[PDB]
RNA sequence: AGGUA
């Protein structure tokens, strides 16, 4: 049987470069993939390798992981905006549109890493079965 | 259908050969001063040649 | 080309090998450097001394040389593909490429024109005409006021 | 290389530069490993009975004179007598091996594989045996993957546990009870899908019965097969990659004569692969010599097909080439021109066929070429549309239709009605005489008499004058 | 007789390209030389584009105006009006997906800017100079990055059956498949409300504007990579007889002949499991031919035999 | 050179060709601008569709003039249909949409 | 002929040597050439010799065969009016004015790489072959360009 | 989008709408920009006009990727289509069509 | 190709 999956949770160095792309003008995505990669240990590496026996199947599985981490990141940012509005933050009109006040703002990177870690724990739970 | 009706009426039938004679282009006139006939070797000559 | 080459480098020679030598290249560099220093003088590309007239004979000879080059390729292929011993050489020379290319030059070319034949003066002018266009000359993408 | 290049020719040369040329004995060594691979796959087919049964069926068909002898076998490693003797002893070995199924069996299998070692068969029959064994692999893996899908998606268990427990017999109820023995929840869940799994196991056993061998031996033999064609394909690809330079050198001679060089080398590579599939060193010749003719044939085929804008048959292309060569010969001999009479004399071909062939040998020209040697107008700007009816003729047709309709209106009811469907006047359909008669409930000479009466009535110089103008 | 208030221009989908097509052009054949009846199923085909002469099947079966609402089922050829041959389009099923040159070498490269990826990289990937990762896995390899031959080999050796990377237009199309527009739009909208950095906000604004515009266009980015190539009606690329050995033929006809030849050769090579070098070469063939057909002149010109002149292209 | 009927073209329907009777006179973009400068609309439409490229409209006009009637079918010039088909020949969708 | 001949074989010691050329008399005169629509041309016949040396050793002729007056094409012959008849139409070859082969030391002016100080460049224009360019940059450096690369 | 190069007529009708309405969003402020005649003709509302007399390939690509939908109402657009121009004699016709559009 | 405005 297969019940071994240790998540490499919580690190200050989980926010140190995730924005790295091999190429110019970094944008969203390719930080999501790094986010859910660094959230899993090499034990999870080997577990994913052994559990799924097909390259297209693992490919689709990684796409599903990307999709779910993106969805949870989106919902976490939505709830953060909601609680900021409930905490007294308003919408500041900049030349990009609405934002929140700096004292009420954090950053998207830590939200993404938290979402990736929670999804990593979810995948571990699905893999310890 | 109208052409078929007319050929049935007049008793005429389609010609086996179509006219392709060289006409003088409209707008020009004049006298035929010279006629050249070139028939390749191995092909029967005609009277004019 | 050789006589102009020696003329612009101020040599008493007016003849020599067509292919360049290292000395000629070095002389060209020295002359260009002297002009850069202001000692030399530039030469117009519009002076009739720098523009040469290829009459009918020279153009025909150049095109015939091109035909000889392609038939040379054919001959060199044949000399190894064909017999390396006695075989009659008329069977290995091809008249089609040379004649076809010569006919292409004389018949269908930028500088082979129907003689404008409505006056004796027209014929004389056409035969005396000098064209800056054609193969190896100037395209109409010009003006380019200098040459005009 | 990475040199801001946009020419496939350049980096094709880069690709061919990586592989180093071979020597004469290098080709022999590569063909030797190819022969080892093909002998391995032949032994794998040998251990498979059904392909041999199919081969014997075709041998029997040939003996019945229903198939060509040269479409089954080509040469042997020491003719109808040799083929008959080898197939007779081969049938004997096959039956003596099959009897051991339905120590000794291993010896019979070894002797069987040995007696196939003499056979050298046509590539088509060998490819058929390979495809049959491949579809055996496909069906075996399909049954295994069906069991996979059922046990995994219906019982919610990981793919890792299945491999250890199921493998070893794979066609019995032992693993069912073995997995149940641990009282696992998925073992209990398997009891609701056990019927489908058992039915699939029954189909697997039926497949084994069809093969006549246990499924484990099927896997062993097919894995030996797979490694066999893997080695063979690797060696063949090595040969093809190492011999690209010959293709490039041969094609560059044909490039000066029109057609893209890249297409020529691609076709030459196709011919090179064909030669590699057909190459042998038992002949004793050099591989380059054999591949040269194949590449030349491929290049000639490419020039015949993909270089002519209009299709010209290969034999017609060869006739054109012969005509051109003889024309050049006569031109350089007589020194004046190729006269059609001598061209007719040299060929068996009359001369009118010669001139029509000469017309065919020329390729179509673009309209984008300027008419008059670089006038800013193109050739296609002058081509008249001959498929368009002139408005003069369209107006004439309209007036004729109006006149015919008026004239038919000038006749009686039934006569005009018969005429309308007889010739298809003013409807988009035409009807035969008997078809009109059936609707007029009169199927006799009467309908044609009515038509003739209408014609005779139209003969009068009161209804024909209006139609007289149209036909002069 | 036709009423329409506006004209829409958009990305043609392979399905609607097949919708335009009446038949698949499978052969580069044109005519029977001596008999000028078009071949089947060549660039000129009555079975696909309609009959040559007015209202008669090109088999000698039906010659009348009566047989016009029913097509000839006794042979491939159909029977309609000849003007239909001026409007029916065809389609060619490309064995390998091919990139559209217009979306590539325009000064703003729509493929380049949609992938936010510089032009040299697309040129090298498409022309088979280097590999690109079409999604990775748990590797140290980014979702998108170009790799050379030895780098790709080292990645493959270091990382096993987790590494999805291809080369050329197939890889580009896979990348466009793996990219989702609406989800990225939502992500950018969330990030903009949270981010306060000037440069980050500018990047987010530019990308959100681009993606929202693309979504409003209602186009799928994968459509930029041509899977099926439409072919123009034959009448718009006419082949008309002319006296002597000369005949007027369209440069489009020769270009499509080259495209069909290279596509069929690619199909044959794939069926024969040809070595990777040869199949890459033939995909290069197909890409170059398609680029010349769409726009000959941005790829180092294409000339034909027996005629030294840049071939006319659709652009 | 003067024509009212004669040589049309294959790829387009612009009337031109023939050393016996030539085509019409090129009503280029300059003349289209000249008509647009006035309130010249119907004359421009005649220049564009009826007499230039609309084969159906051209035939209908000839029949109407012979019959003694002066009106036109706007139709669509065959050149524009050629343009649509040729744009569709690329990987580009172009369509005609109603309101 | 003397430029292209003798033609040396790529291995085989079978060389083709030129002797002379002879112009055949035209089969048709100017008048009948114009009437018949055929070119007014003279056949070109050339004397050539194939020489096979010692096989195989250092050079030196062993055997030689001579082809006399081999026909390698027909060249249009010039009329007394200074014209040529090619397809029954009397054509003229216009003399061409073109830059002479040699060296031109031209001045580059009007475009200065955003620096001013108009420059100089020397172009070696061959009668046949590849151009050579020696040009300057506003940094007082000299550069070589074979053709225009 | 606070930096969008937009046609002034649409901007003017939008600002008129927001001013007459109680909704004063956002906004909205604009600054007129000057473009060369080639650029102005190149960046028109209709891709047919831009593609006709200027860089055709790039304009067509931009329109296709943007999914533009030109609604005519321009002399050259209707010239290409082959209907009456919306100028002079034809202006009466198009004005009629304007009444037939967006209303029964 | 050349010539015309």
Curated annotation (Swiss-Prot), chain A:
Family matches, as Pfam families: Phage_RpbA
Primary gene name: rpbA
GO annotation terms (biological process): DNA replication
Protein name, as recorded: 15 kDa RNA polymerase-binding protein
Signal peptide region: none
Organism name: Enterobacteria phage T4
Entry keywords, A to Z: DNA replication
InterPro entries per UniProt: Phage_T4_P15K_Rpol-bd
Function (record text): Binds to host RNA polymerase core.
Swiss-Prot record, chain B:
UniProt superkingdom: Bacteria
Biotech use, per record: Co-administration of salinamide and rifampicin or salinamide and myxopyronin suppresses the emergence of resistance to both antibiotics.
PTM comment, free text: Acetylated on several lysine residues in the presence of glucose.
Functional summary from the UniProt entry: DNA-dependent RNA polymerase (RNAP) catalyzes the transcription of DNA into RNA using the four ribonucleoside triphosphates as substrates.
Family in the record: Belongs to the RNA polymerase beta chain family.
Complexes and interactors: The RNAP catalytic core consists of 2 alpha, 1 beta, 1 beta' and 1 omega subunit. When a sigma factor is associated with the core the holoenzyme is formed, which can initiate transcription. The rRNA transcription and antitermination complex (rrnTAC) consists of RNAP, NusA, NusB, NusE (rpsJ), NusG, SubB, ribosomal protein S4, DNA and precursor rRNA; S4 is more flexible than other subunits. In pull-down experiments interacts with CedA.
Protein name: DNA-directed RNA polymerase subunit beta
Source species: Escherichia coli (strain K12)
Parent-protein residues present: 897 to 945 of 1342
From Swiss-Prot, chain E:
Chain segments annotated as coiled-coil in the UniProt record: none
Biotechnology: Co-administration of salinamide and rifampicin or salinamide and myxopyronin suppresses the emergence of resistance to both antibiotics.
Annotated residues for binding of Zn(2+) 1: 57, 59, 72, 75
Post-translational modifications reported in the UniProt record: Acetylated on several lysine residues in the presence of glucose.
Top-rank taxon, per record: Bacteria
Family: Belongs to the RNA polymerase beta' chain family.
Protein's job: DNA-dependent RNA polymerase (RNAP) catalyzes the transcription of DNA into RNA using the four ribonucleoside triphosphates as substrates.
Oligomeric form and interacting partners: The RNAP catalytic core consists of 2 alpha, 1 beta, 1 beta' and 1 omega subunit. When a sigma factor is associated with the core the holoenzyme is formed, which can initiate transcription. The rRNA transcription and antitermination complex (rrnTAC) consists of RNAP, NusA, NusB, NusE (rpsJ), NusG, SubB, ribosomal protein S4, DNA and precursor rRNA; S4 is more flexible than other subunits.
Name listed for the protein in its UniProt record: DNA-directed RNA polymerase subunit beta'
Curated annotation (Swiss-Prot), chain G:
PTM remark: Acetylated on several lysine residues in the presence of glucose.
Biotech utility: Co-administration of salinamide and rifampicin or salinamide and myxopyronin suppresses the emergence of resistance to both antibiotics.
Function in brief: DNA-dependent RNA polymerase (RNAP) catalyzes the transcription of DNA into RNA using the four ribonucleoside triphosphates as substrates. Resistance to the antibiotics salinamide A, salinamide B, rifampicin, streptolydigin, CBR703, myxopyronin, and lipiarmycin can result from mutations in this protein.
Family membership noted in the UniProt record: Belongs to the RNA polymerase beta chain family.
Subunit structure: The RNAP catalytic core consists of 2 alpha, 1 beta, 1 beta' and 1 omega subunit. When a sigma factor is associated with the core the holoenzyme is formed, which can initiate transcription. The rRNA transcription and antitermination complex (rrnTAC) consists of RNAP, NusA, NusB, NusE (rpsJ), NusG, SubB, ribosomal protein S4, DNA and precursor rRNA; S4 is more flexible than other subunits. In pull-down experiments interacts with CedA.
Protein name as annotated: DNA-directed RNA polymerase subunit beta
Protein species of origin: Escherichia coli (strain K12)
Gene that specifies this protein: rpoB
Shown chain mapped onto the complete sequence: 53 to 201 of 1342
């Amino acid at each position: 049987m297969t019940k071994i999956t240790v998540n490499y949770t919580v690190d200050v160095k989980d926010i140190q470069p995730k924005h790295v792309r091999s190429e110019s003008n970094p944008q969203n995505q390719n930080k999501i993939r790094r986010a859910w990669v660094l959230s899993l240990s090499d034990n999870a590496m080997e577990v994913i390798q052994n559990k799924i026996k097909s390259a297209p199947a693992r490919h689709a599985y990684y796409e599903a992981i990307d999709r779910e981490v993106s969805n949870k990141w989106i919902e976490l940012m939505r709830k953060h905006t909601t609680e900021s509005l409930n905490a007294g933050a308003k919408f500041i009109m900049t030349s990009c549109g609405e934002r929140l006040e700096d004292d009420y703002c954090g950053n998207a990177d830590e939200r993404l890493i938290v979402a990736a870690q929670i999804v990593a724990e979810t995948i571990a739970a699905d893999f310890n079965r | 259908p109208e052409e078929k009706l007319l050929r049935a009426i007049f008793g005429e039938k389609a010609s086996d050969v179509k006219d392709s004679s060289l006409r003088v282009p409209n707008g020009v006139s004049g006298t035929v001063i010279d006629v050249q006939v070139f028939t390749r070797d191995g092909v029967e000559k005609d009277k004019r040649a | 080309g050789r006589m102009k080459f020696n003329r612009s480098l101020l040599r008493e020679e007016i003849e020599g090998s067509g292919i360049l030598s290292k000395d000629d290249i070095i002389d060209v560099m020295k002359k260009l450097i002297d002009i850069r220093n202001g000692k030399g003088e530039v030469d117009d590309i519009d002076h009739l001394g720098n523009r040469r007239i290829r009459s009918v004979g020279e153009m025909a000879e150049n095109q015939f040389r091109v035909g000889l080059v392609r038939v040379e390729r054919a001959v060199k292929e044949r000399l190894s593909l064909g017999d390396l011993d006695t075989l009659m050489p008329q069977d290995m020379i091809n008249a089609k490429p040379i004649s076809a290319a010569v006919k292409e030059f004389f018949g269908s070319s930028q500088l082979s024109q129907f003689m404008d034949q409505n006056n004796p003066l027209s014929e004389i002018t056409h035969k005396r005409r000098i064209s800056a266009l054609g193969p190896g000359g100037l395209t109409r993408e010009r003006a380019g006021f200098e040459v005009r | 290389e990475i040199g801001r290049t946009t020419d496939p020719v350049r980096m094709y040369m880069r690709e061919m530069g990586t592989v180093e040329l071979l020597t004469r004995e290098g080709e022999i060594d590569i063909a030797k490993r190819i022969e080892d691979g093909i002998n391995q796959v032949q032994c794998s087919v040998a251990e498979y009975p059904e392909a041999i049964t199919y081969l014997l069926e075709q041998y029997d068909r040939v003996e019945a004179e229903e198939a060509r002898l040269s479409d089954l076998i080509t040469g042997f490693v020491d003719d109808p007598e040799l083929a008959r003797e080898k197939f007779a002893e081969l049938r004997a070995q096959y039956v003596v091996t099959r009897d051991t199924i339905k120590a000794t069996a291993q010896e019979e299998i070894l002797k069987l594989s040995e007696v196939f070692k003499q056979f050298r068969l046509v590539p088509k029959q060998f490819d058929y045996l390979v495809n049959s064994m491949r579809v055996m692999m496909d069906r075996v893996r399909t049954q295994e993957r069906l069991i996979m899908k059922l046990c995994v998606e219906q019982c919610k268990m990981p793919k890792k546990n299945f491999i250890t427990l199921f493998t070893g017999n794979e066609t019995s109820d032992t693993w069912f009870n073995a997995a149940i023995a641990m009282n696992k929840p998925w073992s209990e869940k398997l009891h609701d899908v056990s019927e489908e799994v058992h039915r699939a196991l029954q189909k697997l056993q039926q497949i084994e019965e069809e093969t006549g061998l246990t499924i484990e031996q099927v896997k062993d033999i097919n894995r030996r097969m797979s490694i066999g064609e893997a080695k063979a394909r690797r060696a063949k690809k090595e040969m093809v990659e190492a011999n690209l330079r010959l293709v490039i050198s041969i094609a560059k001679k044909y490039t000066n004569r029109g057609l893209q060089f890249l297409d020529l080398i691609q076709e030459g590579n196709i011919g090179l692969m064909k030669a590699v599939d057909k190459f042998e060193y038992r002949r004793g010749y050099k591989f380059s010599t054999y591949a040269t003719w194949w590449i030349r044939q491929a290049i000639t085929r490419s020039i015949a097909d993909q270089a002519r804008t209009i299709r010209i048959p290969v034999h017609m292309i060869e006739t054109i080439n012969k005509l051109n060569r003889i024309s050049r010969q006569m031109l350089q001999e007589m020194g004046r021109e190729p006269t059609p009479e001598e061209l007719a004399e040299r060929m068996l071909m009359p001369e009118d066929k010669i001139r029509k062939v000469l017309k065919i040998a020329k390729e179509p020209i673009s309209m984008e070429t300027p008419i008059g040697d670089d006038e800013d107008s193109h050739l296609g700007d002058f081509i008249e549309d001959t498929t368009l009816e002139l408005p003069l003729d369209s107006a004439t047709t309209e007036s004729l239709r109006a006149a015919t309709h008026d004239v038919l209106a000038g006749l009686t009811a039934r006569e005009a009605k018969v005429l309308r469907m007889r010739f298809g006047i003013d409807m988009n359909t035409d009807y035969t005489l008997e078809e009109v008669g059936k609707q007029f409930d009169v199927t006799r000479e009467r309908i044609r008499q009515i038509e003739a009466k209408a014609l005779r009535k139209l003969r009068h110089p009161s209804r024909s004058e209006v139609l007289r103008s149209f036909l002069d | 007789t036709e009423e329409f208030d506006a004209i829409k221009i958009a990305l043609a989908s392979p399905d609607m390209i097949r919708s335009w097509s009446f038949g698949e052009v499978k052969k580069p054949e044109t005519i029977n030389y001596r008999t000028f009846k078009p071949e089947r199923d060549g660039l000129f085909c009555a079975r696909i584009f309609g009959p040559v002469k007015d209202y008669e099947c090109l088999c000698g079966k039906y010659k009348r105006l009566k047989h016009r609402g029913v097509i000839c089922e006794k042979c491939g050829v159909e029977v309609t009006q000849t003007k239909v041959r001026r409007e029916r389009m065809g389609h060619i099923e490309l064995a390998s997906p091919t990139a559209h040159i217009w979306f590539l070498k325009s000064l703003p490269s729509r493929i380049g800017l949609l992938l936010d990826m510089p032009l040299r990289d697309i040129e090298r990937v498409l022309y088979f100079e280097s590999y690109v990762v079409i999604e990775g896995g748990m590797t140290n390899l980014e979702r998108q990055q170009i790799l050379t031959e030895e780098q790709y080999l080292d990645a493959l050796e270091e990382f096993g059956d987790e590494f999805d990377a291809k080369m050329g237009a197939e890889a580009i199309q896979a990348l466009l498949k793996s990219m989702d527009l609406e989800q990225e739009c939502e992500q950018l909208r969330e990030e903009l409300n949270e981010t306060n950095s000037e440069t980050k906000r500018k990047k987010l604004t530019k990308r959100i504007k681009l993606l929202e515009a693309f979504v409003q266009s209602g186009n799928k980015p994968e459509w930029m990579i041509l899977t099926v190539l439409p072919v123009l009606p034959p009448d718009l690329r006419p082949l008309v007889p002319l006296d002597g050995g000369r005949f007027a033929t369209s440069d489009l006809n020769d270009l499509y002949r080259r495209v069909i030849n290279r596509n069929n050769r690619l199909k044959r090579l794939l069926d024969l499991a040809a070595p990777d070098i040869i199949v890459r070469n033939e995909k290069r063939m197909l890409q170059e031919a398609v680029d010349a057909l769409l726009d000959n002149g941005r790829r180092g010109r294409a000339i034909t035999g027996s005629n030294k002149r840049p071939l006319k292209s659709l652009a | 050179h003067a024509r009212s009927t004669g040589s049309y073209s294959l790829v387009t329907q612009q009337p031109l060709g023939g050393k016996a009777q030539f085509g019409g006179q090129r009503f280029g973009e300059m003349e289209v601008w000249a008509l647009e400068a006035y309130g010249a609309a119907y004359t421009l439409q005649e220049m564009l569709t009826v007499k230039s490229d609309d084969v159906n409209g051209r035939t209908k006009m000839y029949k109407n003039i012979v019959d003694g009637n002066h009106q036109m079918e706007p139709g669509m010039p065959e050149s524009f249909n050629v343009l649509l088909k040729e744009i569709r020949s690329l990987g580009i969708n172009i369509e005609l949409e109603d309101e | 002929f003397r430029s292209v001949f003798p033609i040396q074989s790529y291995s085989g010691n079978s060389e083709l040597q030129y002797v002379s050329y002879r112009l055949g008399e035209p089969v048709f005169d100017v008048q009948e050439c114009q009437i018949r629509g055929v070119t007014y041309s003279a056949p070109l016949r050339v004397k050539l010799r194939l020489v096979i040396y010692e096989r195989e050793a250092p050079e030196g002729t062993v055997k030689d065969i001579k082809e006399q007056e081999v026909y390698m094409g027909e060249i249009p012959l010039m009329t007394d009016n200074g014209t040529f008849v090619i397809n029954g139409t009397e054509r003229v070859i216009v003399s061409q004015l073109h830059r002479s082969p040699g060296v031109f030391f031209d001045s580059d002016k009007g475009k200065t790489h955003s620096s001013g100080k108009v420059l100089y460049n020397a172009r070696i224009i061959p009668y046949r072959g590849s151009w050579l360019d020696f040009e300057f940059d506003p940094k007082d450096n000299l550069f070589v360009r074979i053709d225009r690369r | 989008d606070f930096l969008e190069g937009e046609q002034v007529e649409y901007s003017r009708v939008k600002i008129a709408n927001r001013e007459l309405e109680a909704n004063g969003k956002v906004g909205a402020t604009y600054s007129r920009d000057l473009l060369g005649i080639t650029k102005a003709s190149l960046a028109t509302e209709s891709f047919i006009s831009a593609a006709s007399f200027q860089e055709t390939t790039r304009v067509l690509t931009e329109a296709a990727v943007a999914g533009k939908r030109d609604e005519l109402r321009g002399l050259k657009e209707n010239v290409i289509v082959g209907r009456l121009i919306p100028a002079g004699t034809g202006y009466a016709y198009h004005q009629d069509r304007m009444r037939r559009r967006a209303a029964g």
